[PDB]
DNA sequence: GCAGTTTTTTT
DNA sequence: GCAGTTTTTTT
């Protein structure tokens, strides 16, 4: 799956090299297939391939329609690639064979809309922390969750990357970096007094030593680089 | 090409034999996906087969959406048809492709919607006629222009069918049968002594020996069955 | 894994 | 042919 996966990274990557930008209305230059955004209720996206239309819900807020036609632009990338869809084809079959197709259409989606290129850009200038997670959201125009994703992947140190919200600030969404195997499930509460609600409060950005405060009640050591935004603060938890 | 128009025949027939019946919501019954009716604006329908979604536009009139509906369910037939696929593929290319795929989901729609027991059945009652094309389109729920091109097809005789709405009484849609040459071309007026218009104005039903009246000013003998429907005439002009 | 959305894990 | 919608043909 992996080789798969791969395989979607070198598609969507050489299809975003042949844009002329990333903002929402040059994403479907290289694509013979023309786009709509209309009121569509529940459902985000839809890609005809055979009528060559790319549907986005209008009613959706701007980041998640660009994360759809990404998506939606990652479908057709596939239905191009015989070679990629056989293997697939020979692998998977019947729902399974579903899922796998939405989720490589998810990371080519997010290959197009995050290069390395920035990833690595802020990474260098921001280190792997909470602002590094606020600025790869604003300049990629994705939602902090798929930024978060994308972030913990290309962190090669131990960090926790965790997207916090009032809903009472708890842990909305987290991932952690290739090597770490904790988990900060959302809904874990965050402590008023722990430097993350601190940061929200005082709506200043944070770097200090801290905690990870699991449901467990484990408080494990942990340095803390959290940066407030509205009502919502992205925080990196650095582990040893 | 005409192969393919018959294996799209079969296909669409033994799908709308496992129908429950023709009615719009069980048009879908066969088929592992779901309809969204919705509005379009200037689409009628679209189908993603990836995401299994049937869209239909809400803004348009039923018998509309009805054949749009079944047009998208042909769509369904013929993706999962590789040895017709396959030949279609070796047959045509580019933007030809393009048109023989939607020519064919037109012919299987009709061939959903429009089964050869009820043409034969109205045909049987009510002869290659006016009237027979009228009620093709109220059992069938389709427009009297689908309606037309499907009695057409089989009506064995030469017979001119036309559809005929103030525009002035005007030929709104035509075609012959099998073996008929002459086309009676969309605009061509009708004359206000003429059968048809009589119909119109009286409100009811006339079958008398009348003319087709071509705009070459031709005036070639033909025995005219019309039906005056709201504003609006189908009439079968029967050629020697 | 896959989430794509405001020694500390835990079917 | 392909339209799918209210000797009489005519790129
Ligand atoms: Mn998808
Ligand atoms: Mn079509």
Redesign the interface.
């Known amino acids: 799956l992996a080789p798969a996966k791969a395989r979607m990274r070198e598609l969507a990557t050489a299809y975003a090299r042949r844009l002329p930008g990333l903002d929402t209305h040059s994403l479907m230059s290289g694509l013979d297939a023309t786009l709509?955004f209309?009121?569509?209720?529940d459902?985000d996206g839809?890609?005809?391939?055979?009528?060559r239309?790319v549907?986005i819900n209008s009613r959706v807020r701007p980041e998640r329609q660009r994360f759809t036609l990404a998506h939606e632009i990652s479908?057709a990338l596939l239905l191009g690639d015989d070679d990629l869809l056989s293997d697939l084809h020979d692998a998977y079959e019947g729902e399974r064979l579903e899922q796998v197709?939405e989720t490589l259409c998810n990371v080519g989606a997010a290959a197009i809309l995050m290069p390395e290129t920035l990833i690595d850009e802020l990474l260098a200038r921001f280190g792997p922390s909470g602002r590094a997670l606020a600025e790869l959201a604003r300049r990629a125009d994705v939602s902090a969750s798929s930024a978060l994703y994308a972030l913990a992947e290309r962190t090669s140190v131990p960090v926790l990357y965790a997207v916090c919200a009032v809903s009472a600030l708890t842990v909305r969404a987290s991932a952690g970096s290739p090597g770490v195997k904790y988990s900060l499930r959302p809904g874990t509460l965050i402590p008023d007094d722990h430097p993350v609600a601190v940061a929200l409060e005082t709506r200043l950005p944070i770097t200090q030593e801290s905690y990870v405060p699991f449901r467990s009640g484990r408080r494990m050591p942990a340095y803390v680089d959290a940066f407030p935004e509205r009502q919502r603060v992205l925080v990196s938890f650095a582990l040893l």
Chains 1, 2 share one sequence.
Do not use: S
């Open positions: 709509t209309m009121p569509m209720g459902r839809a890609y005809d391939p055979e009528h239309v549907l479908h197709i």
